[PDB]
Design a protein around this motif. Structure first.
Motif: not given
Lengths: 16, 138, 137
Positions: B41-48, B50-54, B128-138
């Motif tokens: 799960l951590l791999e998927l969550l740090t793999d851009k 995969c952002q369409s489904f997790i 830090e991870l959110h910034a790298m992965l360009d996480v748009k918060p909900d």
């Protein structure tokens, strides 16, 4: 933290 | 599909296979041998790719399965469990809750949160991870 | 220390950069968990593993300089702490029967991929030898 094995008959762990 | 060489190239063109936290590398760090669900799960969550489904929700270590079926499918393919589905995956996540590794977010479905001290283990902070992965918060 | 330092430190030693990652090769073949032949191809394409396992320069032929070490890493990768070359050798007979790996006649701890590994991987033996700076024997 420790990550003890996750191996059950309803959720068996893979190996090979 | 071509050769393995083409396989790697085709996936590189799609910006795949570049997770910040690879499951195999994390498994070597923790000594679990085969990869475990939480590492996957951590791999998927740090793999851009995969952002369409997790993805992360932007709130700490909280994440959601926008498509739980795809997460279960990829887990089945990764572990050679063709019959893998959300029901079995949910039962697995339930086992992680007992060991206080992953908890479910009440009021929202398919939303979970790593409760263990993940920052101390990985050396990364949530933001830090959110910034790298360009996480748009909900 | 942490996982980040673990990745950093190992990167400074030029580790974790195999040409043929086992997990990536497993995803390509659809096998799920990695298999022994994929594990060997990773080590054989990891420059940091040439002390105990390496190619010989002749096609897909390779040798196990330290057969006990390759077994230890195989056991640690599949949670078999008591893994030794004696058991690991037993599993290799499966690949003999399927004409995937053959022992080089007249040479101990020397094997060769007798399958069309070039068509599978897309690499020639000389190509990987050059990338890995292999010294022919």
């Amino acid at each position: 933290p420790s990550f003890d094995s996750f191996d059950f008959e309803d959720f068996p762990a893979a190996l090979w | 599909k071509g050769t393995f060489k083409d396989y790697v190239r085709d996936r590189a063109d799609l910006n795949k296979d570049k997770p910040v936290i690879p499951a195999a590398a994390l498994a070597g760090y923790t000594g679990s041998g085969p990869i475990q669900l939480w590492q996957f799960l951590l791999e998927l969550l740090t793999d851009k790719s995969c952002q369409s489904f997790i993805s992360w929700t932007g709130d700490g270590w909280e994440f959601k399965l926008s498509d739980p079926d795809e997460v279960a499918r990829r887990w089945g393919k990764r572990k050679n469990k063709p019959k893998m589905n959300y029901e079995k995956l949910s039962r697995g996540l339930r086992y992680y809750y007992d060991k206080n590794i992953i908890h479910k977010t009440a009021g929202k479905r398919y939303v979970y949160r790593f409760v263990c001290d993940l920052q101390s283990l990985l050396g990364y902070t949530p933001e830090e991870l959110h910034a790298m992965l360009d996480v748009k918060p909900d």
